[PDB]
Amino acid sequence: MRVLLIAGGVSPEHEVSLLSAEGVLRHIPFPTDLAVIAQDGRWLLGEKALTALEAKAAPEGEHPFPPPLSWERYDVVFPLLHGRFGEDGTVQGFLELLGKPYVGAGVAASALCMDKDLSKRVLAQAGVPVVPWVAVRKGEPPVVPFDPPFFVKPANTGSSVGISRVERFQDLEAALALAFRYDEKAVVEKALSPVRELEVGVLGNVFGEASPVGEVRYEAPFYTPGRAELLIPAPLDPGTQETVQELALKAYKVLGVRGMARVDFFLAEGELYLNELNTIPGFTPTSMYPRLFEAGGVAYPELLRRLVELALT
Amino acid sequence: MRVLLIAGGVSPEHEVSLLSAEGVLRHIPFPTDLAVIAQDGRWLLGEKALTALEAKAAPEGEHPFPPPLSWERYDVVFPLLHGRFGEDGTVQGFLELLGKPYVGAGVAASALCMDKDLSKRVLAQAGVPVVPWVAVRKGEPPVVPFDPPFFVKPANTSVGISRVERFQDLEAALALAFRYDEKAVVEKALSPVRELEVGVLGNVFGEASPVGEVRYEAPFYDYETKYTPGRAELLIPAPLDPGTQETVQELALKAYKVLGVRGMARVDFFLAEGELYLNELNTIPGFTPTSMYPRLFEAGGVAYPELLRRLVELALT
């Protein structure tokens, strides 16, 4: 049982990706090899991979995609990439073509969960509450059936790259234009406030289990934003906490997710809304997902072992 | 401009893929090379590819994936594969990594349109009419909110599809279906129904084609003639009153735009009781110069080479 980890990626979460590879590599209960995708798309195998894993960022790589890697040597591949070319289904399909079992969501589920429009349409349809939104295709005349303020962000592009809060219905044109830079389609969502953020993790294939529920609170700026808190158990009557968990498990089911998902929720005026499912969350031993499950009773090592095994069932 | 055509595939539509590549290869108005995926999953390049085409069926290939192809030599990849590793978005996903512009639907649209459950959900939420249905996942009690009869097909695989007359039979159709896809759909058996087809062309905002109709003729023994095989009839255009033709076409365009499909699509509908029901969207249909999609567009005034030309050109958006 040998495992292959692919960290890095061409997305803005590159550094965090390598940072996660560090945690996994250290506490993973399996002989594990590393492979790195440099910011320039080139791959780094062998020791160059780890040398980069030690530098906290891999500006450039050696092998053009597809890399001359020895997929033969591995039973399971653990992708740790974010956003575009990470959890959008592209890498997953590559793996399907190579016939390699892999950790996490498959093609379809990664692509749906990555697109802010289609995933909302599926969840809405399935009874999961989502924020009132609208999709705006490039060249299509905007039509917001609700008043500002609101959020505009490209349909499917990880990290807040291209997002913006819009106050005046007039400035909506600037928002779209910006977002259009990273995607042909964009979403306009009714901005909530007051608003609390709740996080919950899921483990398992299709019918997974939910970890306890946690709340993300931000501390004052000090200009740098303040340290985000990870309150858990989150301060919600047992009622809403359960509701949040069953809602996540339900969304996890209809979308056919596999392995894991960091499900984010918005709590505004007593109402819940599922913001998004992250098929590949941050994996440092001190990241939101592993910390959530540790609280649920699953050690970092055990969590990784269960994930890798799941890639085979 | 240089185009790379990829046909064959490990799926059951392997043979039909090659015939499509044949038509495409004979009329495409651009220099085009052929790459073939044999049934064993190994690729055939250059001459071997073209030779596999001649025999119509490539049992074995020479190169394990990924193939040693000079992608750089091409401006657009036109993938002609049906089903698994064809419309599911894996090859499309592989092409995104290669950064090559390709013909047809992207990863999401391809994956989504390929799923008989997720696609209906998105279309329903969009107000597009679909046949009542419910999804059932292996090892989970079925909760069919509607009375029989009804069809049970696997969610992502035309095998395993059975017609159920009585509930006591559902467990059988399900078990039957779960031997292909971990997920299946139970649809309300609509009767009587007329099948309607319309082709869409363009990226997201397309141009519909004339509506066509499919009718089956059973095999029979003729007095003078003798045996006469079963037959599928493609009536272009469909014998419908303008209002229905109008609706079915706009309905096609509506669904095409919601799903964000690119390049092309053959949209199928069921007409029953005067109610139109969107059955499914095929992101990569047959391309024989006599397949429904190409014929539909000929009727619509777009010659074959022209249809091919526009498809390729759209790949570059």
Ligand SMILES: Nc1ncnc2c1ncn2[C@@H]1O[C@H](COP(=O)(O)OP(=O)(O)NP(=O)(O)O)[C@@H](O)[C@H]1O
């Ligand atoms: N409708 C909304 N109302 C209030 N706050 C919002 C809303 N939408 C987004 N936000 C805020 O913006 C933050 C990031 O939005 P988010 O969609 O999670 O970016 P993202 O994580 O990069 N999505 P993705 O690109 O698919 O991974 C959230 O944590 C919220 O604090």
Ligand SMILES: Nc1ncnc2c1ncn2[C@@H]1O[C@H](COP(=O)(O)OP(=O)(O)NP(=O)(O)O)[C@@H](O)[C@H]1O
């Ligand atoms: N709800 C229905 N009512 C009446 N007839 C149906 C219904 N569903 C399917 N059929 C018939 O069964 C045939 C095949 O079902 P169909 O779903 O079109 O196979 P498919 O297009 O290959 N999709 P798949 O089930 O994934 O293989 C259709 O051409 C119809 O004639």
